[PDB]
Amino acid sequence: LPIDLRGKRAFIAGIADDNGYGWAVAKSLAAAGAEILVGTWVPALNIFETSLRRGKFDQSRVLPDGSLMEIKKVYPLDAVFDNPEDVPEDVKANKRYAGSSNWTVQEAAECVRQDFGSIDILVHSLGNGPEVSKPLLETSRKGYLAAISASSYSFVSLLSHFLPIMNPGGASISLTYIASERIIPGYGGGMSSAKAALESDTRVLAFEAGRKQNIRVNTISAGPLGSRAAKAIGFIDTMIEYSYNNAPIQKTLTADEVGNAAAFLVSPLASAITGATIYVDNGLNSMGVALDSPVF
Template sequence: MAASTPGLQMAATRPCMSSPCHLFRVGAAFLSTDSKRASWTKLTSSCHISSSQPFQRYLSSSSMKSNKVISRAMAESTDRSTGGLPIDLKGKKAFIAGVADDNGYGWAIAKSLAAAGAEILVGTWVPALNIFETSLRRGKFDESRVLPDGSLMEIAKIYPLDAVYDSPQDVPEDVKTNKRYAGSSKWTVQEVAESVKEDFVTIDILVHSLANGPEVSKPLLETSRHGYLAAMSASSYSYVSLLKHFLPIMNPGMPTFLLCGSSLSLTYIASERIIPGYGGGMSSAKAALESDTRVLAFEAGRKRRIRVNTISAGPLRSRAAKAIGFIDMMIDYSIANAPLQKELSAEEVGNTAAFLASPLASAITGAVVYVDNGLHAMGMGVDSPIFEKLDIPKDQH
């Protein structure tokens, strides 16, 4: 199943990164009561808040409870004694569906989750499995496996996967006998979930990073019913199927400690804006994926306290995206028109995924999170000749 979207790759990904991924950090992790009062005093001054007394009373009444929570948190992770809010996924297991090389968002997400301490399992499209495993074994991905601490990302296990098929009964005979599937077994969604349960018992994070539209280069009016439904099946329903089969083995959330399992997918702005050339029903598939994200957030949240979000990523020069034929033009357009004039890196999407999978995002679910340098916010392309007389700032660097 080859990926076919600028922002959502089926195959794993060589992040367009020039540096190792950097973990998200913000502020100080724990503040003493005095430092909280000092910070509140500055805030009341700058924001014209009339009094800090209610806040001080709150601090006094809850200090013992806060100290207990802080002590427990610090005891669980000595790394936090250095301060900050590090993304800590130690002890967590993540399954990323759609990794088949080191050249896209799936790989970047795996790398960021690994940098945060998660154990990485991947599902690789069956026809690409042998090449991926061989390349990994021969060290072809070693350069892009380097983590911030200098170590190499380890993949605990690689599973053959074709997410178009839910169970063995769904696989047609011509696929079963296809030589590209020879030598592989247990690669339907149901079988992979069962294999992961047998090998690792449970997981904490599920990532859907795959898509396919066999007629993506055709305008929607020229797309066949078969091509349209194939795009929906591979790019949208595959996520529903993955979550359905993996949900029973995902560790349920614990509200007392703000712990929740997390499920993520990747979408693209074509779900809500016209992107000429991005056809074959893929824009419809992305719209369905985002709608499903909201519904799944409710259902998985109520069933097992699992959070469900999707990242709307900007265009990336992955091998899969190049198949569409106009990825370079899309990147140039984004650089010219987005609020931030720079090329998006896969690392930025990977880091966002790590944040969304972490306890720092414990209240975020059912959301579409844009990681596209702000292009989604634009109503018009400012590189149009119609704006040539306006003094629009441009990045000179």
């Protein structure tokens, strides 16, 4: 009983190294037979491509079969910008941007349309919170709005823009986090607020795209992973040790584990699953208390 994506195509918005979930989601979708089209945040695109081409990620490219993952094509992208009339002269002038073009979501989707004409799977695997290090109390309107835009509306734009080239029976998946639903000290700047909306949008978009084009929409609320961004937030390591001590099952969490879950959810086996928020966290979220409390 395979998770079969053979003949399917996927657009993965959010890889820039072999260190996060997106890469992992990509091996899984690759491993299932899907054709990978990666969405790379412009700034990182150059180095990613270079590293990729020269082989920095070769081991990371080894599929379950021993074969290596192939990345069909890499498109530069910035999910905060929907169309060319939207970018600011400052943003355009802003260096890296000079080097690749057609990187707004609308443009990206267009290149893809022209390039392969359609996709089946759409994978959101990005976000950003300029003030993540601040408590909601110390978080500015702009910062808050930035987070919501980058981490939340970014999914709405991509889906909306790609939907027209998504083959019926296709699906999308995103990566959320428990902070949307529970208080997680340290995840500030409106990032919490952002997942909440991302998750809410999943249910809404599920209805809309489901009815519009029989496309499924879900999201995976993932456990902590020392990705690049995570390490940037700076609390992930403790979070990894927290999850290790206190989860129903005690073990490591691996990118791998979120990847397969995503591959499943975007496959035909998951045909009756839509509007979901699946927790791939070793059950952590289901705990009523932490085992490690000094009181115990």
